[PDB]
């Protein structure tokens, strides 16, 4: 019988851990580049990289806030290298995707109302944000098994390089705020920490490491090819919107609240102040193409086939209730189908307030989805719209927000709508895999316990670190050495504005590399 | 010293994983049975069964919604068989209990506002729900250690059989919905996927598997016995309500919001429309047994010992405020204690709406608990009641909902009230265990890290897969080969309607089987 | 090649677990002490201690609730000892910190609206709380690897001793509650349970155990020394507020709701009913020092540099709106900077209610931080304040709560403000560690996956149980055998009241002990 | 296993070219061997592999 009540406890190697902190050198196209140098004869290994960033005090007029997880969203590229070349690198989007299921790391990255609320400054000496520090946990392959997976420095010099994105990407601002001045005065101040182990008489053996490599297809192509595939552990596909032909303007953003219903509530709340207007006589200050109609005594307004129920309480006798009936409208020919945002409301009730001279809306019933809130403002006034398009007031136009969030997936902020209806992977000339439903994403989420998985073929099911991972292997003799991905996008109605958002296909392939310690640290591609 | 800075990496078995999808054969009281045939000599192993279901478009009038986790709630029975007989099978209730701590799984099964809101249709060709797909993760014993525990096929054919519940179980509807037509045109459309491993030169060894078996006691009996118990790893006990002598109709259901406070707010908001009435003179349209009392000027109405504070703002000059003082009442003798739902309110404030002719309630103080929310409507009008019992309007009665949720435990929807006061397990003639408080449920939740455990005796604490599980073993010489459970139910007040809900005792015993691979897969019960 | 599709199942030791419940002997400055004797020749080992407590019915008038996690907040000290002396013991604060990442355990220890809502009784016979039972999971070092790490009883008698905190610690009450009567008749009723193992032919070997050891520095000293350090696994530093120079009264507590926003909204809710008063003529019932100013028809009141926007709806024509402009004020010299709570508000909007003769508030704009919610009432009226101080009504003064919660950290209830600005740890005369930012807290939270970590130096990274833990070892020959800690407190403004809250420095040292089984259970100190 | 997949009517273009017809259908042709004088070539089942 095997003993389940006792173990012979082994004695480990004698070591001593230490928290180490280094400051960096900043250098300046004109992208920020920080270089850190780790040189110490007594540091045998390291892992658990942490980057700290000091955010400066922000003053002036306008509305200003930071994007969620700013610390992660700032990193464009990371590089650990030695005398023999690059040991490991990753793009910002692969790092964020790997850290998406670690909620404590996301909390330390910067997720609070003090940072992420859209604050207002009313005077040139107002303080919008107090100074604070954020901490980015750079999750690496070196963390899986604690001491077992640490990076061994075979007495060589290791240098770490962090490339930052430009500061316009991580800031959410409107047009009143003086961005060119904030951009002229902003500087990144980084610091790097890691755990070092001082080990007596270490005996190092070689190990394996995976380096992600991504390829971005051309605009609107339903294809993308990954070349030079010799040992891949997985393959993942998703789409990114490209907003370069726009001004990057969006109507609203909810800030710290991140539920889908929070996004929808923020959109409805921004429109309601322009939808129902209480005024003396026909309302003024809107473009002439707006057809605004007074509500009859029975309280029902019919817009073609749609019925809107409008009941406002405590309205003074010398005032009326008006309804904007074509707030946003899109069409391609003058008497065909119309996408009309005001037809998506069915009941609107509320109470007017005579103290503040505005209407406080109560319960709303609507069918608004995330896509309407995710349509960029410039698509409403494009040259292909045969109607005017935007009949909002100028005061409301001044509340629009520039958003250059770099890690948006799908065609909405939450990646909820699935626009890939069929996927086909080809290895050489033969069909490796095809699917009609998102069954490979269901499998990815079950296997990794994540809420935001992607379409992933996983080829490795072997326990980490203690075994050589299993791979799909090229057969150059038979021509199998490239992975072609081809999708068919879902069909949408040409009168919905989202048909004209441009899309890109992103393929990610994890290659397997061999780490060796013959005269310094070196890596070798496995073939 | 043991090295904690290096590992000799093992080369694993050479293999290739593959996603496979099958379509099934459908067969047809007249419950649907689907059977899928898996035949391929190169699929050596499988695990991670996922079942997909197509839900159709729903048209017509009435109120309609799906139960939460509809994909799981649809499965009545699953069987996996080969040429030698049944390998494994489970009831839908045991499957749901095994999957109740997997939040990712429950999310994929279909839990969202678009499926689970109670939607209203107004016109015969209105679309209530769009078509959508749900995914049911059939958790099996083969998933514990990934590749280690997978089901080995020894060149034999494998068959999977899924029996579905009738569609009345998964729909929450009112009386206006045309159920015989929906039930006549609804069909289940299933598809099965799994991960297959192609293994070169596989070396199979025998394993161990746990097969659940359930026994149902008679109505209202406090006993149950499992015969032929030779090697059990655990023993579970819980209660189910039996609504078969009723029409299964209830007053409210909260839908997507699933907190206890949400159940109470939904129930209170269903009652409030009938509780405080603003009328011109005594309100009409109510049964004669209603006791409607005008509220005095100081705002206090006394119902015997209870005081109700009623303050309503902006009431027009030609109107008064009335209070229904016996909305629901139940009693067994004409001068004993009375259960009265009107006495559970203490303060009622709100404001009147001139535009919509209704009250918008603002702040309520009450002591309503979950049991009032879980009392079926038909118990109020039972022949035991010496009072009329139900004094709601007919318009209120027409909005009631049919609910046939099959996996409800306890006597309330959340299994919160513990109605088992004492438990006694007998092995042969000796008292194995007995308890008063729910200390064994506390242990079950600590040991499995679940929020919804049951009273469970666990006999096995050895790490899974790598050891033969520990069991309680029969002593046939002494005659100890059956487990009889006896409970004592907690006493309730004879004037509470919940005392007359009928209960069933359910006992679940996990037996141990030996899997062997001498010419195909076979199981043998251990003696 | 290693087989990853099969394994040889080891037969474990033959055993039989059993749930065992014991009753205690209560004994009695006047702190309750419960002693339990475990003596039965057939129990070989135990773990998983659970303590149950019956809380009695509470009757009378006044406001009364329980602190969150009553069961854990009640325990002052735990000791397990045999005839040879103490085997293990821990203080209540270290136990709570060890179990703070276990949400299941916190849920069983008592966290619900039934217990934690602040209830009101109106007559001397009103029942405030129903009797209920709470469960305290006493997490031990014997739980890491289940059966592998369980405490073996080598035929000796084991005694468990629970020392209770006085009932004043776990109760939140106002002044109208009869505390001395409740305290005279309250009685702790404990019962202990554990899981025993009947083992045939057990084979016992010595193991390793860690005993936390606490040291508390003097009041307001920035230093603290830990003597007799020969093998420490970690070192922790934090601060506790000391309220001994006050009466322990606070303005608000949110009860069941535990978000930081909930703390703030409860504080604002208590202030707003006194901030804006609707009255016919100058409001009465305030101290002579109050400067109450009428709000002009324009709606803007200017208070020095601050501008307050006040808009109240539905105010009757014969009444006016007044604003309390110095509700709480603190200063140390007569014409310098002033901390004024009225200037922390910028916009106040709401609607008047003619039924309840009070204001229902709508949108509020404020800058209240958790420190304002965490200032004791005694500090506003201290002898160093050169102003009167508290111009609130006596009706508002009667709703303050006594709170003696024993495990508060930081200087606010949520441990959000970081008041330690620099930390230096000395080992002998050499600096072992120094830091400016909270990098050691970031590492503690990443490594333990908690949200309430402390500043911790960790020295052990080897897998538990199977390896002997790694320690920092004393060199008494060179004199390095003590751990000194020195902090510098962050500078605060001399006109903020929090500058005068007294602080204590807490150091926690985890000492390593060896457990041996040569004739009974014994421990030795590692040197 | 996927034997064949196509997005455009390339198998119908091939059918029409190979049989000189104006009204072909989507056809996988497995036999290209002269008629009658040879045993035609076929795609053959492998019941062992399903």
Residue numbers in the entry:
A (entry chain D), B (entry chain F), C (entry chain E): 18 to 45, 49 to 547
D (entry chain B): 450 to 499
Lines from the paper:
In Vaccinia virus (VACV), copies of the double-jelly-roll protein D13 bind to the viral membrane via interaction with its partner protein A17 and assemble into a scaffold surrounding the viral membrane. This process leads to the formation of a spherical immature virion (IV). The 62-kDa D13 protein exists as trimers both in vivo and in vitro, and structures of the recombinantly expressed D13 trimer have been determined by X-ray crystallography. D13 adopts a double-jelly-roll structure composed of 8 antiparallel β-strands.
Image processing of D13 trimers revealed a small subpopulation of adjacent trimers bound together, forming doublets of trimers. Although the resolution of the resulting 3D reconstruction (3.9 Å on average) was not fully isotropic, it allowed unambiguous positioning of an atomic model for identification of the intertrimer interfaces. There are two major interfaces that mediate doublet formation. Side chains of R353 in the EFH loop and D325 in the CDH loop extend toward each other, suggesting salt bridge interactions. Another interface is located at the base of the trimers, which would be proximal to the viral membrane in the IV. The clearly resolved features in the reconstructed electron potential map between Y62 and R498 suggests cation-π interactions as the main stabilizer at this interface. Furthermore, the doublet is characterized by a slight twist of the trimer axes defined by a torsion angle of 8.0°, leading to an arched arrangement when the doublets are linearly expanded. The absence of the N-terminal tail α-helix in the doublet structure suggests that its displacement likely helps to initiate intertrimer interactions, promoting ordered assembly of oligomers and leading to formation of spherical IV-like particles.
